[PDB]
Design an enzyme around this catalytic site. Structure first.
Site, PDB file in Angstrom:
ATOM      1  N   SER A 196     -28.696  26.143-102.913  1.00 26.71           N
ATOM      2  CA  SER A 196     -28.841  24.820-102.287  1.00 26.71           C
ATOM      3  C   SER A 196     -28.456  24.770-100.808  1.00 26.71           C
ATOM      4  O   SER A 196     -29.249  25.194 -99.968  1.00 26.71           O
ATOM      5  CB  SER A 196     -28.080  23.759-103.095  1.00 26.71           C
ATOM      6  OG  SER A 196     -26.729  23.738-102.756  1.00 26.71           O
ATOM      7  N   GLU A 323     -33.088  19.929-111.636  1.00 35.17           N
ATOM      8  CA  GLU A 323     -32.260  19.902-110.435  1.00 35.17           C
ATOM      9  C   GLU A 323     -31.523  18.579-110.273  1.00 35.17           C
ATOM     10  O   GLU A 323     -30.396  18.553-109.756  1.00 35.17           O
ATOM     11  CB  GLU A 323     -33.122  20.132-109.205  1.00 35.17           C
ATOM     12  CG  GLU A 323     -33.844  21.435-109.191  1.00 35.17           C
ATOM     13  CD  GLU A 323     -32.965  22.584-108.753  1.00 35.17           C
ATOM     14  OE1 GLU A 323     -31.722  22.442-108.706  1.00 35.17           O
ATOM     15  OE2 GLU A 323     -33.533  23.642-108.448  1.00 35.17           O
ATOM     16  N   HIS A 436     -28.764  21.899-111.657  1.00 32.77           N
ATOM     17  CA  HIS A 436     -28.593  22.438-110.314  1.00 32.77           C
ATOM     18  C   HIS A 436     -27.410  23.408-110.242  1.00 32.77           C
ATOM     19  O   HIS A 436     -26.251  23.019-110.476  1.00 32.77           O
ATOM     20  CB  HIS A 436     -28.399  21.267-109.353  1.00 32.77           C
ATOM     21  CG  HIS A 436     -28.285  21.669-107.922  1.00 32.77           C
ATOM     22  ND1 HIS A 436     -29.314  22.274-107.235  1.00 32.77           N
ATOM     23  CD2 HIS A 436     -27.264  21.541-107.040  1.00 32.77           C
ATOM     24  CE1 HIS A 436     -28.937  22.496-105.986  1.00 32.77           C
ATOM     25  NE2 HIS A 436     -27.698  22.058-105.840  1.00 32.77           N
TER      26      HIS A 436
HETATM   27  C1  LIG Z   1     -25.162  21.459-102.712  1.00 32.48           C
HETATM   28  O1  LIG Z   1     -24.378  20.826-103.733  1.00 32.48           O
HETATM   29  C2  LIG Z   1     -24.044  19.460-103.768  1.00 32.48           C
HETATM   30  O2  LIG Z   1     -23.560  19.105-104.870  1.00 32.48           O
HETATM   31  C3  LIG Z   1     -24.232  18.484-102.612  1.00 32.48           C
HETATM   32  C4  LIG Z   1     -23.103  17.753-102.084  1.00 32.48           C
HETATM   33  C5  LIG Z   1     -21.676  17.883-102.614  1.00 32.48           C
HETATM   34  C6  LIG Z   1     -20.574  17.227-101.721  1.00 32.48           C
HETATM   35  C7  LIG Z   1     -19.500  16.330-102.427  1.00 32.48           C
HETATM   36  C8  LIG Z   1     -18.954  16.899-103.744  1.00 32.48           C
HETATM   37  C9  LIG Z   1     -19.496  16.289-105.070  1.00 32.48           C
HETATM   38  C10 LIG Z   1     -19.536  17.292-106.245  1.00 32.48           C
HETATM   39  C11 LIG Z   1     -19.312  18.786-105.852  1.00 32.48           C
HETATM   40  C12 LIG Z   1     -19.373  19.808-107.013  1.00 32.48           C
HETATM   41  N1  LIG Z   1     -20.162  21.024-106.794  1.00 32.48           N
HETATM   42  C13 LIG Z   1     -21.398  21.474-107.441  1.00 32.48           C
HETATM   43  C14 LIG Z   1     -22.212  22.440-106.762  1.00 32.48           C
HETATM   44  C15 LIG Z   1     -23.444  22.898-107.375  1.00 32.48           C
HETATM   45  N2  LIG Z   1     -23.862  22.450-108.580  1.00 32.48           N
HETATM   46  C16 LIG Z   1     -23.076  21.494-109.293  1.00 32.48           C
HETATM   47  C17 LIG Z   1     -23.560  21.025-110.604  1.00 32.48           C
HETATM   48  C18 LIG Z   1     -22.856  20.091-111.357  1.00 32.48           C
HETATM   49  C19 LIG Z   1     -21.645  19.580-110.850  1.00 32.48           C
HETATM   50  C20 LIG Z   1     -21.168  20.008-109.621  1.00 32.48           C
HETATM   51  C21 LIG Z   1     -21.868  20.985-108.791  1.00 32.48           C
HETATM   52  C22 LIG Z   1     -24.342  23.917-106.648  1.00 32.48           C
HETATM   53  C23 LIG Z   1     -23.741  24.647-105.438  1.00 32.48           C
HETATM   54  C24 LIG Z   1     -22.916  23.738-104.603  1.00 32.48           C
HETATM   55  C25 LIG Z   1     -21.835  22.999-105.424  1.00 32.48           C
HETATM   56  C26 LIG Z   1     -23.316  16.864-101.020  1.00 32.48           C
HETATM   57  C27 LIG Z   1     -24.572  16.658-100.448  1.00 32.48           C
HETATM   58  C28 LIG Z   1     -25.673  17.342-100.932  1.00 32.48           C
HETATM   59  C29 LIG Z   1     -25.522  18.250-102.006  1.00 32.48           C
HETATM   60  O3  LIG Z   1     -26.646  18.924-102.481  1.00 32.48           O
HETATM   61  C30 LIG Z   1     -27.743  18.947-101.622  1.00 32.48           C
END
Ligand SMILES: COC(=O)c1c(CCCCC/C=C/CNc2c3c(nc4ccccc24)CCCC3)cccc1OC
Ligand SMILES: *[C@@H]1O[C@H](CO[C@@H]2O[C@@H](C)[C@@H](O)[C@@H](O)[C@@H]2O)[C@@H](O[C@@H]2O[C@H](CO)[C@@H](O[C@H]3O[C@H](CO)[C@@H](O)[C@H](O[C@H]4O[C@H](CO)[C@@H](O)[C@H](O)[C@@H]4O)[C@@H]3O)[C@H](O)[C@H]2NC(C)=O)[C@H](O)[C@H]1NC(C)=O
Ligand SMILES: *[C@@H]1O[C@H](CO[C@@H]2O[C@@H](C)[C@@H](O)[C@@H](O)[C@@H]2O)[C@@H](O[C@@H]2O[C@H](CO)[C@@H](O)[C@H](O)[C@H]2NC(C)=O)[C@H](O)[C@H]1NC(C)=O
Ligand SMILES: *[C@@H]1O[C@H](CO[C@@H]2O[C@@H](C)[C@@H](O)[C@@H](O)[C@@H]2O)[C@@H](O[C@@H]2O[C@H](CO)[C@@H](O)[C@H](O)[C@H]2NC(C)=O)[C@H](O)[C@H]1NC(C)=O
Ligand SMILES: CC(=O)N[C@H]1[C@H]([C@H](O)[C@H](O)CO)O[C@@](O[C@@H]2[C@@H](O)[C@H](O)O[C@H](CO)[C@@H]2O)(C(=O)O)C[C@@H]1O
Ligand SMILES: *[C@@H]1O[C@H](CO)[C@@H](O)[C@H](O)[C@H]1NC(C)=O
Ligand SMILES: *[C@@H]1O[C@H](CO)[C@@H](O)[C@H](O)[C@H]1NC(C)=O
Ligand SMILES: *[C@@H]1O[C@H](CO)[C@@H](O)[C@H](O)[C@H]1NC(C)=O
Ligand SMILES: [Cl-]
Ligand SMILES: [Cl-]
Ligand SMILES: [Cl-]
Length: 527
Positions: A196, A323, A436
């Site tokens: 991502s 996603e 995702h």
């Molecule tokens: C890019 O990841 C984003 O979540 C994102 C944010 C996240 C910024 C604020 C945090 C909220 C939850 C974070 C938990 N971190 C997860 C991650 C992934 N998958 C998850 C799946 C389920 C639960 C948590 C996840 C994939 C890799 C990165 C971290 C802000 C703006 C845009 C975004 O995406 C375009």
């Protein structure tokens, strides 16, 4: 024991017993002067030589960041939170070397995602010791500044020029160029890969002139720069910025003297006002992200892409089936990970107001129209599933296809996958599907460890994914040649063929999410 001599000093690693073999890990190699004091916000100054022997046998500090607390105690979310001390002192990298030392090995450099506000390389599912052992490549990953401290933008002024975290990344690619041959790697066969926000990062390295010489090809997992959340504008950038300046009460007007003010302020203060600088956030708000700074990015990346201004090379691009689901439980009404989240028409309506807060009434109705003249009526999950598709298509799947069409239109080979397997060790409920980020564990070969509870067919799928990824890194073709595997065909913007990854089938399909992406990538942006 094993010591390697780098261009600015000597580093010691540790032996890892992996799969009856041995992998040498170098965790925590500094690659820049710590961006502290008079250096906070500025580009990453390069690291002066040392005469010690650096003990790189543990993951270094994770960069300062805000921690998701919506599900305390729940592995599915806490799996993503940092697992080392947070500090501004945080520009380090890790190297996984197959034992014994290879001769001229392909290098894989991982860039983590996190919406440019979160992330760290220490995460369990970014562990490269498996890729080192199995395919005999070198795996490198690095921490890079995130949030305001890594992407605050006073366009022009170099005490906060913008894109600093991207420049962090870039100086680490520089490090493996000067140093990785000492580790037995081949600096001329480097493949960048990330997920991502990491994926959008590496698509931006395909554009940024200063990176074209620092890598060979690229793998974009579930992300790309033309996604709506990836690039914050230049006017909304420094509107976001100065909003923080008043919150911290750091508003000077010698444009520079605001910066000096934000550096006698301690990192926690800055962390906690990032949320409001966008007045109406969403679950996807990159409060502080990549901007057009005229150093890393010299023009709006969409135009660079449309007019073929990027490193010519092979890309491997792909997305996951569900996603969007991960984000609905972070805000959307009637959703929860502890029930099946069946929402009515009006619950869905109010859910568009949360993902599209500054979009007209017509725009929201436009989305409702495309996504709810149903393939039929009863199913109470209609609005629940429509809303997840709405977020997934707008935010990830259609940007990625559009990137691949436009990239491949300049003669380069493109490969597109479509990951549709739900981990059985996966702890989120079943209505959320192939979420995702949950391809990452298969890419890194975690299901190859049988001791940690994965289906036998899961380990098999991880097995070809890993092989395909490595053949792509080493040879530019992500085939599995031997075990009678489905050939992965090149993505031409003509026929638009993609490969599906699952434990049943490899299949070749065509023209992914046709009807939806024509809505998203043309009728919808005019509004
Ligand atoms: C890019 O990841 C984003 O979540 C994102 C944010 C996240 C910024 C604020 C945090 C909220 C939850 C974070 C938990 N971190 C997860 C991650 C992934 N998958 C998850 C799946 C389920 C639960 C948590 C996840 C994939 C890799 C990165 C971290 C802000 C703006 C845009 C975004 O995406 C375009
Ligand atoms: C970096 O790491 C090495 C070794 O770490 C290894 O890491 C793991 C992954 C495994 O591979 C393990 O095998 C290792 O632990 C560190 O090396 C250590 O260096 C210290 C230096 O002091 C050693 O301590 C002893 O050394 C001398 C030996 O003659 C003793 O005399 C010392 O005691 C003296 O202390 C007084 C000094 O004021 C002196 O006046 C007294 O007379 C007293 O005798 C001291 O106890 C230690 O033994 C080494 N490690 C091992 C396993 O032997 C290295 O320090 C690390 N560097 C860092 C962390 O910066
Ligand atoms: C650009 O910035 C102004 C001012 O930022 C406000 O203050 C921040 C501390 C933050 O917490 C929010 O209150 C605001 O973003 C924005 O003007 C605000 O606009 C909203 C409605 O959009 C209004 O309700 C607030 O009262 C306004 N606040 C002030 C101080 O004027 C503005 O929306 C930002 N964006 C754009 C595109 O102009
Ligand atoms: C699915 O669950 C959501 C979650 O809300 C619950 O609220 C608590 C009181 C408790 O029951 C927890 O288990 C959950 O966190 C439900 O949403 C709520 O719905 C009610 C009435 O419909 C409403 O008064 C609340 O404001 C809602 N709260 C939130 C956060 O949405 C939802 O109704 C459940 N749906 C199904 C089909 O089970
Ligand atoms: C400063 C930071 O973020 N982390 C420290 C780390 C610990 O997080 C801290 O000590 C809290 O427990 O501590 C480090 O190391 C110490 C040595 O520097 C010191 O001589 O005393 C200990 C002897 O073993 C300890 O090792 C570490 O453990 O790496 C330094 C690190 O930056
Ligand atoms: C490594 O490979 C490159 C070509 O990929 C070659 O030019 C170079 O000489 C090789 N060096 C070593 C040390 O293997
Ligand atoms: C004030 O502004 C000028 C002009 O941009 C700049 O040269 C100077 O460094 C700033 N700060 C101070 C302390 O003078
Ligand atoms: C291919 O099949 C053999 C058994 O015939 C198996 O041992 C091996 O691990 C498989 N490799 C891949 C990459 O599928
Ligand atoms: Cl209806
Ligand atoms: Cl209605
Ligand atoms: Cl349409």
């Amino acid at each position: 024991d094993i010591i390697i001599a780098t261009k600015n000093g000597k580093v010691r690693g540790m032996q890892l017993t992996v799969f009856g073999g041995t992998v040498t890990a170098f965790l925590g190699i500094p690659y820049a002067q710590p961006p502290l004091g008079r250096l906070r916000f500025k580009k990453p100054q390069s690291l002066t030589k040392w005469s010690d022997i650096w003990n790189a046998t543990k993951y270094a500090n994770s960069c300062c960041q805000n921690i998701d607390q919506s599900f305390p105690g729940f592995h599915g979310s806490e799996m993503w939170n940092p697992n080392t001390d947070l500090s501004e002192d945080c520009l380090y990298l890790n190297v996984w070397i197959p034992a014994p030392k290879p001769k001229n090995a392909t290098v894989l450099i991982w860039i983590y995602g996190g919406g440019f506000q979160t992330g760290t390389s220490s995460l369990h599912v970014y562990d490269g010791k498996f890729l080192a052992r199995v395919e005999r490549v070198i795996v490198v990953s690095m921490n890079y500044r995130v949030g305001a401290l890594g992407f605050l933008a006073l366009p022009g002024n170099p005490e906060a020029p913008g894109n600093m975290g991207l420049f962090d990344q870039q100086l680490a690619l520089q490090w493996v160029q000067k140093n990785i041959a000492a580790f037995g790697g081949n600096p001329k066969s480097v493949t960048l890969f990330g997920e991502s926000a990491g994926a959008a990062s590496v698509s931006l390295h395909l554009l940024s002139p200063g990176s074209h010489s620092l890598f060979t090809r690229a793998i974009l997992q579930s992300g790309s720069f033309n996604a709506p959340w990836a690039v914050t504008s230049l006017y909304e950038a420094r509107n976001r910025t100065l909003n923080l300046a008043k919150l911290t009460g750091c508003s000077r007007e010698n444009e520079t003297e605001i910066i000096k003010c934000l550096r006698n302020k301690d990192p926690q203060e800055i962390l906690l006002n990032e949320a409001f600088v966008v007045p109406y956030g969403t679950p996807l708000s990159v409060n502080f992200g990549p901007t057009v700074d005229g150093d890393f990015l010299t023009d709006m990346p969409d135009i660079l892409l449309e007019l073929g201004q990027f490193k010519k090379t092979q890309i491997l691009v792909g997305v996951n089936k569900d996603e969007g689901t991960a984000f609905l439980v972070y805000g959307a009404p009637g959703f929860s990970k502890d029930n099946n989240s069946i929402i009515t028409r009006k619950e869905f309506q109010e859910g568009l107001k949360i993902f599209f807060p500054g979009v007209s009434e017509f725009g929201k109705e436009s989305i409702l129209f495309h996504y709810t003249d149903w393939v039929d009526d009863q199913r109470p999950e209609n609005y629940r599933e429509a809303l997840g598709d709405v977020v997934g298509d707008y935010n990830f799947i259609c940007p990625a296809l559009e990137f691949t069409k436009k990239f491949s239109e300049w003669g380069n080979n493109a490969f597109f996958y479509y990951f549709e397997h739900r981990s059985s060790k996966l702890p989120w409920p079943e209505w959320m599907g192939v979420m995702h980020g949950y391809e990452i564990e298969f890419v890194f070969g975690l299901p190859l460890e049988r001791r940690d509870q994965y289906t036998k067919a899961e380990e098999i799928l991880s097995r070809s994914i890993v092989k395909r990824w490595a053949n792509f890194a080493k040879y530019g073709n992500p085939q599995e040649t031997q075990n009678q595997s489905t050939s992965w065909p090149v993505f031409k913007s003509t026929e638009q063929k993609y490969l599906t990854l699952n434990t049943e089938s490899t299949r070749i399909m065509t023209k992914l999410r046709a009807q939806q992406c024509r809505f998203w990538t043309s009728f919808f942006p005019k509004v």
